[PDB]
Design a protein around this ligand. Sequence first.
Ligand SMILES: Cc1cc2nc3c(=O)[nH]c(=O)nc-3n(C[C@H](O)[C@H](O)[C@H](O)COP(=O)(O)O)c2cc1C
Ligand code: SF4
Lengths: 429, 56
Amino acid sequence: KTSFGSLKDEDRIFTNLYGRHDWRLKGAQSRGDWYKTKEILLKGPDWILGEVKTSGLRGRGGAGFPTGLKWSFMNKPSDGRPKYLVVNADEGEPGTCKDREIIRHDPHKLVEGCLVGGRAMGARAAYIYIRGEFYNEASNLQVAIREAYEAGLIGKNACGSGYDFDVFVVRGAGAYICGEETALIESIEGKQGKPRLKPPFPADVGVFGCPTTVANVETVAVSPTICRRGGAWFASFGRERNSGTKLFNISGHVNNPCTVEEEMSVPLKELIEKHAGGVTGGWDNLLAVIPGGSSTPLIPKSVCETVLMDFDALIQAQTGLGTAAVIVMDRSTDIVKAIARLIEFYKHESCGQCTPCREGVDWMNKVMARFVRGDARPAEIDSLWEISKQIEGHTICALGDGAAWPVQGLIRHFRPELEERMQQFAQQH
Amino acid sequence: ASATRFIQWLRNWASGRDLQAKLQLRYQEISKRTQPPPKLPVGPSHKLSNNYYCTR
Ligand SMILES: Cc1cc2nc3c(=O)[nH]c(=O)nc-3n(C[C@H](O)[C@H](O)[C@H](O)COP(=O)(O)O)c2cc1C
Ligand code: SF4
């Protein structure tokens, strides 16, 4: 194939995305959930890991590592410690709200995903870490989990397959950094959500110091359908090495902001127009797009004309797919202010553990505040660029990179606006 | 500078020089003892970027 998009309803995975069908077990089963789960479990961990590998699935939490290889780090003999699956439902990236829909409208897909993914890893239980603000969603998930326990689908002799598997829901207490996989683990252990250095890796020393895999809600919830319909069915969608379907959040200056499921590698322009109703005020009113959550650099309208929505295409555009949260800014936007607010966000979310982000992001925030008003000199633009490069790659976790990239995107594509703002300020004062 | 014309002629003739053009004593030609404040320039390391110490 060379064109991707126009995914048909029969090929969509999250068929209750909009919550217009019963989200409880009866509704879930009528839609295909929990079907031949026992046969999947008995096929074995090696078979399950092969199916996820052939599917070409990559992490949906923002980083996009190959899921099959990542989950294979667990496929190792016991050494006395329990093994755990940790499901990342922190869902904290600004612009991103996809995992919210899965948890509250398709909870049984997530619950089955834990069991199947748990089996492939040899894990005895799954801890689903969900952000504290999602109280109603977590309560929905607990109800679905109880239905699974009562029906014998999870717990002792899960699905009548002889495999014991528990599913626990743990709520966060308000911290974006707890979406980071090691910070998430530290939070479950009752500590401050501060990421660990690696090594060790979670597959060796994880939650409670035991082998762990942290997987995104969307990554886990699509696994049972991949095993049922085959890896090759999943790989038939999207470009090579960009396989599958994807949940997209289109927000910002669009006519109909929404969440939708679409094929990977769909053109960005097609995604905004077909599903979101187009850019507010017409396509030509577009200014810039943040293609995959606040941590990915913005791209200008010129780049947005032809760019595809997948990992490799967006990396080539000097950005990233991230969480596939598309934030649209039209030409009425104060682009400098919009980015400055994201830096203010990262400043509020930095855990403060390590020097370059604890001090650097706050420093970038102060400089961006002045850049919004023009209260700076042009020579400070290159200084701000250099500061961002001293944070990126020098911190414990990727939040430091996530704060540096938005600044770099602004300077790369909108330097004249920054300089014009400074000229206006100097003339006035 | 206060020497009379005759004394100027006398000491000029005795020395063989025009002494009055190059007097040893200083008068009003010297710089004022109060000057406007300076504003000194800064060196080439006074930059906000492209200035890592390991390169200089
Ligand atoms: C600051 C920060 C916040 C993150 N937030 C989330 C999140 O909310 N949900 C998520 O799935 N991954 C989040 N991640 C990525 C996780 O650390 C990790 O890569 C992911 O959970 C792995 O799951 P996956 O392989 O299925 O993508 C975040 C990373 C960082 C650095
Ligand atoms: S980069 Fe920021 S959030 Fe990550 S460990 Fe360092 S201080 Fe904490």
